[PDB]
Amino acid sequence: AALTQNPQFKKLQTWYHEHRSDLNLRRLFEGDKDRFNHFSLNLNTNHGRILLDYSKNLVTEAVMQMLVDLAKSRGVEAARERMFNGEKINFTEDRAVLHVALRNRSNTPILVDGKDVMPEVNRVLEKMKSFCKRVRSGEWKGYSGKSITDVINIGIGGSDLGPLMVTEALKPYSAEGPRVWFVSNIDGTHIAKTLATLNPESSLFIIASKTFTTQETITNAETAKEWFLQSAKDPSAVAKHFVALSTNTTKVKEFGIDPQNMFEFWDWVGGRYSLWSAIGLSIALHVGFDNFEQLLSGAHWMDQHFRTTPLEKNAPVLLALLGIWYINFFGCETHAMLPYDQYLHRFAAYFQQGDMESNGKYITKSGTRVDHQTGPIVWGEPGTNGQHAFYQLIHQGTKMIPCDFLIPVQTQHPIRKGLHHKILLANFLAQTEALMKGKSTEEARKELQAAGKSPEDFEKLLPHKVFEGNRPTNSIVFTKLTPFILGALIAMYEHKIFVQGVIWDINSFDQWGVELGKQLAKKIEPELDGSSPVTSHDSSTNGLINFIKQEREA
Amino acid sequence: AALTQNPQFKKLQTWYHEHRSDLNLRRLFEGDKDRFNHFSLNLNTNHGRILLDYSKNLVTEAVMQMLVDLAKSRGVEAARERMFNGEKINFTEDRAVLHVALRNRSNTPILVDGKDVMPEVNRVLEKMKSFCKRVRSGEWKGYSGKSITDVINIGIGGSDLGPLMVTEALKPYSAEGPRVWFVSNIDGTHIAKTLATLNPESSLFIIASKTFTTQETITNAETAKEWFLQSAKDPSAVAKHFVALSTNTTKVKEFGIDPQNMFEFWDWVGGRYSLWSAIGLSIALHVGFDNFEQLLSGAHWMDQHFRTTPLEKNAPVLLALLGIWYINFFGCETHAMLPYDQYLHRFAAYFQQGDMESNGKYITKSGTRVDHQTGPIVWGEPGTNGQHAFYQLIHQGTKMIPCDFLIPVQTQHPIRKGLHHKILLANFLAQTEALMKGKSTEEARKELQAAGKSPEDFEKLLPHKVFEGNRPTNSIVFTKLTPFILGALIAMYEHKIFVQGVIWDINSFDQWGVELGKQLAKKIEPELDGSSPVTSHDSSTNGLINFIKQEREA
């Protein structure tokens, strides 16, 4: 019962059940003339600014205060220190959760079982630094004596989304770098379409697997290895073409990679929190190590803000709390992330793993089942595209959907005297104004009247033209999307998800839920082999397997 | 009250409220030994097959029968005929809804205000046919006498998602075609990154805008025009480089496109239903007109199945009904679409516009507000990636999420003796088996015991290892993903969404909800111009605008 047994939690339920009607945005903006000023946060990293405007939420000062009391009372401050100090807060796996050590630029000693982890972090980083410089300069040559023109990452999940989202987002900083490719799906299409344009002489394969036993990754890695070896024919040619990002040295070695080509990381680095480690090799390689270092520093900035700022004015804490409000009180299943930035088109997708794999849990620290909601379904596409696809439902559908709107004030392509970004900004501001204010029958009526129509004509059309409004949103507006700020953005959401799991009392850092599917896939594999029918399962799985064998021959 | 006033609807509520506990999948599979056979649909298009297996749903025969009775009683059969006969079922705009005429390969006369629309459909199609043949053969030359190597589509929403999703999906059929690019966001990045690799001599721009007044599309189209004219310098060079896909001739002409270069379509072609019209020019151009014709034919096949098959065995109807069950009875906000196919990676996104823009409505045919849920939030990523990102929440989160699993039995890249697809299939089957069966405390306990652990060790770990299961899914398995089948797939979901809006009594074919945002963006635009602060809005919009002016100079 943890959450629901909490006195501040219970106090919130009663207020909510009592004031819900009092929560109208339009009216809330009449009441407080500087609502904006009281519900916004200006952070200055000294490398640009981030405005967190949370004023368009169904919230009051009283609510915010009660939300902060819940966070204190549930041990957010202390949980937080346990994380930074290297304690084993991943309680089911008995692990430390230290993505924060990866970008610990100050090199404060962080101990895990007495041992400072930092000398190992800084070491792989220098290895990274020298390897990037060699590959980028052309010093690193391939087997026929050529320079690398193409970097190909092989990994799935955390070994995939981070790299890709970041390289897609930091595109402008990549001119002096080799091209990157990301092969992730076991679907043979993924590898086949990539390989069919590459030249093995100028290609570098990165096998990013924390365990180095993930089925799809290892079989994509073998397929590539076979493709390469048809050209190279000399097995030692593999050492100039393949590198590994893992924790398991023995497995790396058994795959044939030169131990000198292994960049390692640690069990305390979670997959969906790993872009900051050796897993980001493809980012640095593409955009330069210097920019990678800057990405890590932005995250270091946000780390420091998270750890030392009081909750009432703590960006990640505020975001976590607003989410709990909509999830455990208003009942909302989802949360949209809508970056008005084309380079950020994989952002939302990145947080689907980041939020959902972390917080889609139902067991408590006590081993008790939750009797309340946990993580939302996170989704979204970049604006303004989204506007022309699914906003109709956000404005006039039957569900409440809290949304995060994000945008840089300065664009990397100020074309046509900055006309494009101007229209982009104008739509970013108006969508939230419109989700807020809506439009009553009267306003629409007055418009139809003006458009010169006549009440008998428009009588049937009018209601379809009404917007109820009162829909909540956050607006996060930062100076420019550079590696520094992008680092601060990501780390902000990381701590958001963290605060949430603490209030919920779950484990944000394991993922036991992945297991059953993998167990069952292992038994189905050999069964697919003959043309003989299967009967060892439920009638559905059998029926499918059997239609498959019949059709494969068709 | 329409839906909720329906006697069969009310009968369902009581049964539901009464038998919910009886709805356990595991047990339902013990009871009926050929549940599979009674809850599956084998369609044979004669160009491959589509298995619709709906057996892993919380449903019984009784429920299905009551669901079918609801569809009949709410006029699904008749609504359907009104659509095919050209009636004005888009009741708020007073339009006919005829995406089905676009792919009416039999050329049955379909009348709109007495006039057969088919001679106009077939005409633009032949124009399409000849233009594709000229551009593909190299006969069509650019201003410096060169062949086209690059086709660039400019449009947003429906003028964008369809083309892109289909070209991404039919990639293998595109070798003899020019490359395609899709510029959609007003964000200047989108155009700038595309243009910076193109050669204006071998580039063809397509301006796809139904109204030809969409802000972002027209401003991207001007920017491209400016880029081109810096090289060409002769305004008449525009006629060999720009084509338009619109309804508004006058607007096309006022933009400077040669009327001979205009491919038109009709007001009765909805944006999110337009890939079948002249809007698919970029598909045919890339994959050949013959394959486009095949895509249209597959949709024609499904059209015929939809119209003439009795509801109890009608694919789109069955899919619609299962969705209404989860939405209006179980309460689920969403619906995941999980194609286990890398080429289908934009599929889900395509249906976000397709489902959500159509059915995110709240006003009835009577102008009454709905007092029940409408369209779900549709989302998803292709498997197996999804597995390594958000499945943890589907298996062990606190929300029920109906999922559609899709896959071809035959892959276009049977590499390594079809090992890759084999693993892909095995995961496709096991995920649904696992969402179904789960794993009790006892099973997990027995496993931990076996892994040689000891009850005092594992006592705290055990519950995290339990899967409750009982989670519903559909499995749609088709022979191979060709243009024909892809056409049948898309048309199937189109009619799914259609059946739903009818049962809900809403309008699936307008989108009034897009308007307010556009109205408000129009006023914010000029305000962003000076360095002078704005005060004409709520404190939030003002605060944002003002932070923007301060930062843009920073």
Domain positions in chain A are: 1-98+294-514, 99-293, 515-554
CA distance A453 to A445: 10
- Window B:181-240, CB contacts with A under 8 Å: 184-193, 215-216, 219, 223, 226
Residue of B nearest to A56 (CA): B540
CB contact under 8 A, A477 and B548: yes
| Amino acid letter for position B346 | R
Tokens representing B265 are 């379509």
Question: Which of A201, A264, A357, A381 is flagged as catalytic?
Answer: A357
Residue of A342, A398, A463 lying closest to B190 (CB–CB):
A342
Distance CA B65, CA B312 (A): 8
CATH of domain B99-293: 3.40.50.10490
Classify strands B111-112 and B115-116 as parallel, antiparallel or unpaired. antiparallel
Are the beta carbons of A223 and B467 separated by less than 8 Å?
no
- Round to whole Å and give the CA distance between B239 and B255: 11
Distance CA B246, CA A71 (A): 55
Judge: B340–A187 Cβ closer than 8 Å, yes or no: yes
Is A357 catalytic? The answer is yes
**Which of A32, A49, A58, A185 is most worth mutating to test chain B (most B CB atoms within 10 A of its CB)?**
A185
Active site residue B518: yes
Supply the CATH classification number for the domain B515-554: 1.10.1390.10
The answer to whether A544 faces chain B, any CB pair under 8 Å, is yes
Q: How far apart are CA A327 and CA A320, in angstroms?
A: 10
Break-preceding residues in chain A (C–N over 2.5 Å): none
Helix (H) or strand (E) holding B406: strand B403-410
- Whether the bond between A384 and the residue before it is cis, its omega within 30 degrees of 0, is yes
In the stretch 310-369 of chain B, residues with CB closer than 8 A to chain A read: 332-334, 340-343, 349, 352-353, 356-357, 359-363, 367-369
**Contact list, B525 vs chain A (CB under 8 Å):** 422-423, 426
Residues 6+ apart with CB under 8 A from B281: B128, B131, B132, B206, B208, B243, B245, B263
What are the backbone dihedrals phi and psi of residue B52, each rounded to the nearest 5 degrees, phi first? -105, 100
| Those residues with Cβ within 8 angstroms of residue A127's Cβ, 6 or more apart along the chain or in another chain | A263
Q: Are B156 and B217 in contact (CB under 8 A)?
A: yes
Task: Give contacts of A429 with chain B, Cβ < 8 Å.
Answer: 521, 524, 541, 544-545
Q: List b or e across B376-402, with b for residues whose CB sees 16 or more CB atoms inside 10 angstroms.
A: bbbbbbbbbbbbbbbbbbbbbbbbbbb
The closest of B303, B384, B397, B246 to B103, measured between CA atoms, is: B303
Output the CA torsion sign for A495, A501, A505, A509: negative
Rounded to an integer, what distance in angstroms lies between the CA atom of residue B545 and that of residue B533? 8
CA-CA distance, B157 to B25, in Å (whole number)?
Answer: 39
Catalytic residue among B264, B293, B357, B381: B357
Which residue type occupies A99? H
| Measured distance between the N- and C-terminal CA atoms of chain A, rounded to whole angstroms | 56
Residue type for A113, please?
A: D
| Tokens matching residue A511 | 């993922």
Q: Which two tokens stand for residue A211?
A: 């365990």
d(CA B507, CA B499): 11
Element (H, E) at A68: helix A61-73
CB A202 within 8 A of CB A138: no
- Architecture field, domain B1-98+294-514: 3-Layer(aba) Sandwich (3.40)
Q: Dihedral angle at the C-alpha atoms of B359, B341, A377, B4, nearest 10 degrees?
A: 30
Q: Where are the alpha helices (DSSP H) in A505-538?
A: 515-527
B377 touches A at CB < 8 Å:
yes
Alpha-carbon gap, residue A406 to A425, rounded angstroms: 10
Q: Which of B476, B174, B179 is nearest to B343 (CA)?
A: B174
Residue type present at position B157:
G
d(CA A321, CA A70): 9
* A259-269: burial string, b at 16+ Cβ within 10 Å, e else: eebbbbbbebb
Q: Identify the three-state secondary structure at position A395.
A: helix
CB A186 within 8 A of CB B423: yes
Instruction: Please tell me whether A138 is known to bind a ligand.
Output: no
The answer to whether B301 and B45 are in contact (CB under 8 A) is yes
Which residues of B fall within a CB distance of 8 Å from A357? 389-390, 392-393
| Chain B residues close to A34, C-beta within 8 Å | 539
Instruction: Give me the residue label for tokens 């404060």.
Output: A108
Of the candidates A38, A388, A422, A446, the residue annotated as catalytic is A388
Please state, in angstroms and rounded to a whole number, the distance separating the CA atoms of residues B410 and B407.
9
What is the signed CA dihedral for B57, B63, B67, B72, rounded to 10 degrees?
140
Which of B52, B274, B341, B392 is the best substitution to test chain A (most A C-beta atoms within 10 A)? B392
Contact B157 A414 (CB under 8 A): no
Residues 397-436 of chain B with CB under 8 A from chain A are 397-399, 401, 409-416, 419-427, 429-434, 436
Which among B188, B439, B520 is the nearest to A434, CB-wise?
Answer: B520
Given the residues B72, B518, B522, B523, select the one marked as catalytic.
B518
| Nearest residue of chain A to residue B512 (CA atoms) | A465
Chain B interface, best mutation among A421, A429, A439, A481, by max B CB count within 10 A: A429
Q: Same topology for domains B1-98+294-514 and B99-293, yes or no? A: yes
